[PDB]
Design a protein around this ligand. Structure first.
Ligand SMILES: *Cc1cc2c(cc1C)nc1c(=O)[nH]c(=O)nc-1n2C[C@H](O)[C@H](O)[C@H](O)COP(=O)(O)OP(=O)(O)OC[C@H]1O[C@@H](n2cnc3c(N)ncnc32)[C@H](O)[C@@H]1O
Length: 477
């Protein structure tokens, strides 16, 4: 019995060794791996003691440790088959401090909760994810990208300090100035080098309102050229995203329920915001008029709405409530998330949207560019080698057991896109990747593999951490 000395640890919290089903599923709703135990930590010391114990067993133990955030992983990345799942949200509380234009947040804290606290001081983080009900540790283990990344970089570019429990069970406080290799390793590190128990996030003064804008384009070339010009301009919009709309009719009528019209085939939606304060509405109106005057969208499709900063940032939670009401939230999510270099974007769009795809009815297609200069080259993040690259997110649901959608249909369409990228040398890199072999991961990492592998031996030599990533099998190094 390897799990009886685990039950002998004098934890601040406790272990669950039978009631473990909730930790054997994720948002992907496809993979289910029953863990042997679930740690509900009462402190970071509990996490460190659990990791130290597993490490003390050496190479003769199949025990693994997976930190679970909000479980938004799509293919078992936060699960541990016959291992130990650490419920990071058990430490949410509790150690949330705002000081000096920074917020110190537990790793298991949701971004929505970081924002609610921070707003009480008139402050907020600068860089977001589209959905806020995700943990600080979970999004930083990836990158955390939204409409602000073009300017502030991803969330991983807006963190100043991390408190980590390494795969050796050591508790380390790190930053660009102390234990910097661990700091940079953890950022986009896919949970490979340790568990982030606390993060210092940079803040900026928060606006009270946002002018939220949506416009349509018929031409991809003009759509993307306008996005690229907006991401390079000075005093531009505060959020820049885009959507690919395949076949769908009554798009302006769907917007009419929330947005004010001004005035009443593959289409492209450009989504923008301009941050503002009530006492400075006229300056915003003038600045927005100027910015829009340089764009080439279909004028009759201009829709806008004035909302609070919180209402805009938490917008996806409204869609979550509607899906939960229709029992459409916990369905399989066979998402495909790609990073496409600027030089390949048109060739990609021609084949993917013009040929491979017939409709976009089972989920949105995100498409927008970012600036590579905002991403630090020392992290574990994998990005294309061009100064401008695009995030392309195929955020599909599979509500059907057969036919149109249908995990088998979504999976076939995803394979076709990836096979095209490979055959036509697009230079694509996947975001939120789910490779099953170390050979597929070596190719993904490419020139950055050696760095990733050396950091792994340094911080998790026995490969105890985040086995669901499938990069390093237990004790394989
Ligand atoms: C479900 C979802 C995801 C999502 C999104 C919208 C929805 C509805 N919108 C995103 C967006 O606009 N931009 C973006 O960059 N990502 C977006 N995502 C994906 C999301 O960021 C990720 O799924 C991410 O993993 C964060 O979510 P979460 O907190 O749910 O974390 P997890 O899924 O349980 O675990 C992720 C991996 O990291 C390891 N892990 C978890 N917590 C930690 C800590 N504290 N320290 C170290 N590693 C940790 C897990 O073991 C797993 O491998």
């Amino acid at each position: 019995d390897m799990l009886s000395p685990l039950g002998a640890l004098r934890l601040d919290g406790h272990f669950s060794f039978h009631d473990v089903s909730a930790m054997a599923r994720d948002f992907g709703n496809q993979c289910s791996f029953l863990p042997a135990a679930v740690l509900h930590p009462g402190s970071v010391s509990d996490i460190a003691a659990t990791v130290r114990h597993v490490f003390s067993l050496g190479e003769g133990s199949p025990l693994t440790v997976a930190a679970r955030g909000h479980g938004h992983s799509l293919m078992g990345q936060s699960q541990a088959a016959q291992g130990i799942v650490v419920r990071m949200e058990s430490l949410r509380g509790a150690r949330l401090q705002v000081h000096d234009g920074f917020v110190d947040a537990p790793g298991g804290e949701l971004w929505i909760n970081v924002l609610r606290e921070t707003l009480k001081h008139g402050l907020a983080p600068k860089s977001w994810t589209d959905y806020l009900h995700l943990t600080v540790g979970g999004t930083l283990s990836n990158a955390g990208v939204s409409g602000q990344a073009f300017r502030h970089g991803p969330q991983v570019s807006n963190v100043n300090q991390l408190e980590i429990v390494t795969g050796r069970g050591d508790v380390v406080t790190c930053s660009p100035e102390d234990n910097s290799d661990l700091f940079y390793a953890a950022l986009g590190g896919l949970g490979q080098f340790g568990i982030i128990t606390r993060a210092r996030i940079a803040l900026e003064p928060a606006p009270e309102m946002v002018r939220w804008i949506r416009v349509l384009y018929s031409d991809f070339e003009s759509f993307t050229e306008d996005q690229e010009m907006l991401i390079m301009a000075e005093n531009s919009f505060d959020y820049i995203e885009g959507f690919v709309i395949i076949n769908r009719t009554g798009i302006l009528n769907n917007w009419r329920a929330s947005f004010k019209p001004q005035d009443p085939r593959v289409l492209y939606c450009l989504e923008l915001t301009k941050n503002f304060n009530s006492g400075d509405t006229d300056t915003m109106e003038q600045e927005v008029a100027v910015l829009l005057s340089r764009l080439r969208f279909i004028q009759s499709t201009l829709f806008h709405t004035d909302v609070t900063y919180l209402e805009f940032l938490d917008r996806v939670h409204t869609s979550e409530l509607k899906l939960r009401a229709q029992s459409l939230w916990e369905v399989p999510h066979p998402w495909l998330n790609l990073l496409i270099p600027r030089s390949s974007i048109r060739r990609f769009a021609t084949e993917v949207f013009g040929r491979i795809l017939k409709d976009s009815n089972n989920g949105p297609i995100l498409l927008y560019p970012v600036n590579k200069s905002k991403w630090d080259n020392k992290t574990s993040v994998v990005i294309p080698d061009e100064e401008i690259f695009y995030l392309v997110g195929f955020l599909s649901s599979a509500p059907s057991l057969s036919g149109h959608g249908s995990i088998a249909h979504a999976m076939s369409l995803n394979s076709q896109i990836v096979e095209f990228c490979e055959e036509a040398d697009i230079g694509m890199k996947q975001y939120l990747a789910h490779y099953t072999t170390q050979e597929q991961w070596k190719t993904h990492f490419g020139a950055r593999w050696e760095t990733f592998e050396r950091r792994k031996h340094r911080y998790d030599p026995l490969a105890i951490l985040a086995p669901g990533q499938r990069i390093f099998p237990k004790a394989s190094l």
